[PDB]
Amino acid sequence: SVLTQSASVSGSLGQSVTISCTGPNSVCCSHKSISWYQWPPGRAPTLIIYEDNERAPGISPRFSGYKSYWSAYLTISDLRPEDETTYYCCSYTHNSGCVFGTGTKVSVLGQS
Amino acid sequence: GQLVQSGAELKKPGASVKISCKTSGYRFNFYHINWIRQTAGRGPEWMGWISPYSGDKNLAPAFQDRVIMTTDTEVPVTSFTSTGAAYMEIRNLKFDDTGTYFCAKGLLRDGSSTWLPYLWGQGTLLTVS
Ligand SMILES: *[C@@H]1O[C@H](CO)[C@@H](O[C@@H]2O[C@H](CO)[C@@H](O[C@@H]3O[C@H](CO[C@H]4O[C@H](CO)[C@@H](O)[C@H](O)[C@@H]4O)[C@@H](O)[C@H](O[C@H]4O[C@H](CO)[C@@H](O)[C@H](O)[C@@H]4O)[C@@H]3O)[C@H](O)[C@H]2NC(C)=O)[C@H](O)[C@H]1NC(C)=O
Ligand SMILES: *[C@@H]1O[C@H](CO[C@@H]2O[C@@H](C)[C@@H](O)[C@@H](O)[C@@H]2O)[C@@H](O[C@@H]2O[C@H](CO)[C@@H](O)[C@H](O)[C@H]2NC(C)=O)[C@H](O)[C@H]1NC(C)=O
Fold this sequence. Notes:
- This is part of a larger assembly, with chains A and B.
- Chain A is built from no helices and 10 strands.
- Chain A is mainly beta.
- Chain A is globular, with a radius of gyration of 13 Å.
- Chain B is mainly beta.
- A molecule of 5 linked components (NAG-NAG-BMA-MAN-MAN) sits between chains B (29-30, 32, 51, 53-54, 56, 58, 109-112, 114) and A (94-96).
């Protein structure tokens, strides 16, 4: 698609992991807001961060994020088994629809 | 908000299908109805951001003219917690227009993040076959 990710990231239980989103100038981080969504396969999405760093209601403080001129980042502290699901980031403006990128899977290491 | 999808359809190429979701427990006219699909061979594609209060619609260039979006008048069951429904018709379905379709309630009424999907329904299956 237009908005792309690394496709696969990983990290150990209890540690931090970073997921990044990049793309062409038409999806440049300097003009459009980046949202993040948990999207397990076969189940409804859950909103995580509506705007680069604004945490959605009910989301534990271990989820946070930041943005750079050329990229957007979601930081997940203290990975848990339920965090294995694929996460997606879609960019948007107040007067245009959110455009969805590719997903990133998370491998949570050290499980029984 | 208990956004509930009416159900799945199993259509043939060239048919028209109306996909609908119902609400219960929030003010229908306060938030947008977001139509989004997840396709097995592509993943989430998005479809459109339709307002139930006004006639304003924001439709992806990919789907202009193909799909007609509309909402129903809300039913005031109780103040601040109304019911209602919205639906869209997708014309001239292709083999690519398969997979799982979702309805979603908008996050906020104002601010830079308004119209953004927040509360997602259960979803329905479309086989186009
Ligand atoms: C009764 O309640 C209804 C429903 O809640 C209110 O309608 C909402 O009102 C808010 C505030 O006005 C709306 O938010 C605004 O959305 C605009 C998008 O609409 C324009 O652009 C799209 C293009 O995608 C067109 O389709 C559409 O026709 C419009 O032309 C934003 O552009 C607005 O942005 C404002 O704020 C940002 C910062 O946050 C600034 O950058 C902008 O310059 C601008 O000032 C704004 O976000 C919301 O969309 C409406 N929701 C619905 C469901 O309709 C009514 O306003 C309210 N009635 C009264 C009298 O208060
Ligand atoms: C935006 O508001 C709606 C509507 O609830 C409003 O806020 C509540 C805290 C309360 O003051 C209500 O009277 C207001 O109308 C939120 O939707 C749900 O509201 C109910 C109210 O009983 C609440 O218990 C639920 O947890 C709310 N959430 C869901 C998912 O149903 C909505 O969550 C608010 N959005 C944000 C981003 O905060």
